[PDB]
């Protein structure tokens, strides 16, 4: 049932343009947020938005607006890789490659070796979407802090010596770099 395309950090005018182009070339449905059907995420400015992260997590193409301008002139969807934001988001190309090379439904394994995490319901981004991010990267999330060996986000409970209390940036940077970052920098107070 069709694939979706989503715009992020996109100026109004460029949005209009994209709507036109997609209207002309077909093949895509415009969506407001990255979901299971999304395969392309177009960005006006290379900023790390939720859509960008989610798009990386699902192995989508994370591209610059230009891709839509050349596609319109050539009369069809062209090579995405030339417009892929690999420099700002090294994980984009990697995850995409994994997703395509994947035999059957793809699912990330970035947080496979990680222990169960508790994500603060006061976290930024919103705990739901941040948990989504965790699960799309093969992570595990408990609703109970007591089971977690890693707690992410604002937390004023008793601090166990064995537990790791980290910021959301640990997750975010890990997804961006596609390498699990060193917790030492992301230690909360």
């Amino acid at each position: 049932p069709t694939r979706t395309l989503v715009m992020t950090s996109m100026p109004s005018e460029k949005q209009n343009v994209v709507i036109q182009v997609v209207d002309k070339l077909k093949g895509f449905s415009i969506a407001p947020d990255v979901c299971e059907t999304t395969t392309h995420v177009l960005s006006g400015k290379p900023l790390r938005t939720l859509n960008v992260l989610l798009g990386i997590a699902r192995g989508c193409w994370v591209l610059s607006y230009d891709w839509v301008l050349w596609s319109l002139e050539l009369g069809h969807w062209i090579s995405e890789e030339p417009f892929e934001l690999s420099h700002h988001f090294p994980a984009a190309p990697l995850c995409r490659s994994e997703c395509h090379l994947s035999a059957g439904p793809y699912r990330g394994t970035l947080f496979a070796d990680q222990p169960v995490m508790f994500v603060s319901p006061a976290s930024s981004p919103p705990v739901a979407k941040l948990c989504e991010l965790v699960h799309l990267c093969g992570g595990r999330v408990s609703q109970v802090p007591r089971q977690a060996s890693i707690v992410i986000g604002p937390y004023s409970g008793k601090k166990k010596a064995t537990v790791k209390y980290l910021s959301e940036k640990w997750v975010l940077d890990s997804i961006t770099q596609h390498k699990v970052c060193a917790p030492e920098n992301y230690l909360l107070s």
């Binding site: 950090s9 790390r48 939720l50 930024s124 959301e168 940036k169 975010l172």
Partner: peptide, 6 residues
């Protein structure tokens, strides 16, 4: 409002 950057 523009999408937040994290």
């Amino acid at each position: 409002q523009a999408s937040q950057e994290y």
